[PDB]
């Protein structure tokens, strides 16, 4: 395993998802996308500093918090190779079941670190949310607020969606899940018919790694498709020419949050793509080492 960036964790409410890649939060892509919305309204052209004084401060604190867990990440990577490389396994002096117990303890400690050291920043996300709700209030319109920008940003978003190869990922993950369990069932039969446990544990462990990353690939794929399908629906549906300000606020929140999910999943699906590509090359090689 060259990199273990594929690990993530969500809060106990399962509402805030933290990733090892910038900006770690979808909410920052929300706030980053608000820098586009605020440029079109001369009535609120004060967010250029707020994005720099607050959103950049929140992002800088988020990057530092992940770096604190880097020492804990290096400990997990060491246990990854001992368990996935039988040649490296034959050097230590404990059983495989004893090494799994050290892996689950170190993994959740690393995943728990990303959440524990970022709890102060997750509470800051809702702070800028209310500031955005308050900042948008300064629009001089009240009952006939313009919706041209709202649909114009959907025009921009649907262009970025065509660069996203969602169909290729679905066929990729379909073959992968078909190839994953097919190799798992083949190991289930060989398990009792040979006597090479050290190599079989490297299979089942790398299979467990694939199974977890597949779960992350399936979740990020569905969240991307949901954002793509919902934003597309707002362009094919009704197009009101002017709505109220309170109605316009949730509009920016609706597409500003959805596009944050798409860009967040685009960063994760790309990373989870190579992670599954790399991890499968381990199992295919490890089975070649069995014959």
């Amino acid at each position, epitope marked *: 395993t060259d990199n273990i960036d594929y690990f993530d964790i969500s809060d106990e409410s399962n509402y805030y998802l933290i990733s090892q890649l910038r900006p770690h939060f979808s909410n920052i892509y929300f706030f980053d996308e608000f820098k*586009r919305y605020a*440029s*079109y*309204h*001369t009535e609120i*052209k004060r967010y250029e500093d707020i994005h720099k004084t607050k959103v950049n401060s929140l992002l800088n604190e988020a990057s530092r918090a992940i770096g604190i867990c880097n020492r804990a990440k290096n400990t997990v990577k060491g246990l990854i190779n001992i368990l996935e490389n039988p040649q490296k396994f034959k050097t230590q002096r404990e059983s495989y079941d004893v090494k799994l117990r050290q892996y689950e303890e170190k993994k959740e400690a690393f995943r728990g670190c990303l959440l524990n050291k970022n709890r102060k920043n997750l509470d800051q996300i809702k702070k800028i949310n209310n500031e955005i709700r308050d900042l948008l209030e300064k629009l001089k319109c009240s009952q006939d607020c*313009q919706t*041209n*920008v709202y649909f*114009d940003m959907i*025009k*921009i978003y*649907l*262009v970025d969606f*065509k*660069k996203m190869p969602y169909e290729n990922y679905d066929t990729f993950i379909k073959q992968y899940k078909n190839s994953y369990l097919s190799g798992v069932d083949m190991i289930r039969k060989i398990e009792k018919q040979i006597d090479n446990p050290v190599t079989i544990n490297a299979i089942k462990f790398t299979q467990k790694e694939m199974g977890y990353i597949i779960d992350r690939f399936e979740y990020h794929l569905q969240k991307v498709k949901h954002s793509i399908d919902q934003v597309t629906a707002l362009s094919d549906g009704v197009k009101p*020419k002017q709505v109220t300000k309170n109605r316009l606020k949730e509009y920016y929140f609706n597409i500003g949050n959805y596009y944050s999910i798409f860009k967040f999943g685009k960063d994760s699906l790309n990373m989870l793509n190579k992670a599954l590509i790399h991890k499968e090359k381990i199992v295919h090689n490890l089975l070649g080492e069995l014959f």
Partner: antibody
Amino acid sequence: QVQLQQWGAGLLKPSETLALTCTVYGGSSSGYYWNWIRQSPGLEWIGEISDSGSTIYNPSLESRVTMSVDTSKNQFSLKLTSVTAADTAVYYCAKAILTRYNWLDPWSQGTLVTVSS
Amino acid sequence: DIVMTQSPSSLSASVGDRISISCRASQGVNSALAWYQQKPGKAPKLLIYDASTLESGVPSRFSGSGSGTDFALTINSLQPEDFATYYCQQFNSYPLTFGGGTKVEIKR
């Protein structure tokens, strides 16, 4: 939706200053990227400006173009200098959303500019 | 300074025909192309942007294809309401360069 209305002086003596202006109806003249294109019997791109701070002109006439955006009056103006017969064309203003998404959805009806004494 | 060139410069077709104008770019321009239509004594009307995206309300017979260097606009079922001069414009770099135009004279 947003509309564009262009007004200016068509006839121009040489060496004068071609000064046009486009007033935006249905939307604010702010963060949008506003372009200027001229057509002579083809379509030549003059320049683009934005309230954000990105203003780019065509190198062929960079040394003579001036653009501005008035958020209060909801207007943006183009300016040409040292005008000659080579600048006789129909001048359009158009709206671009972003600096990487420069397709121009609305066009003004144009102002036929003739350079002659 | 990207040089956009579109061919043919003139085109004549039947009423129920199907034409296809091509636009070639001097350099790679990814999928950043806008196709326009200009009727006499009017302003250019947007038809297709980003090579494949159709503008709202534009008739669906207008087809956009191509990526990178070469592209093509295809009218699929001609109509007397399509006699115009069609252009292609890129926006991967500045300055924005327009095509030469393609006059489509309908035969009746």
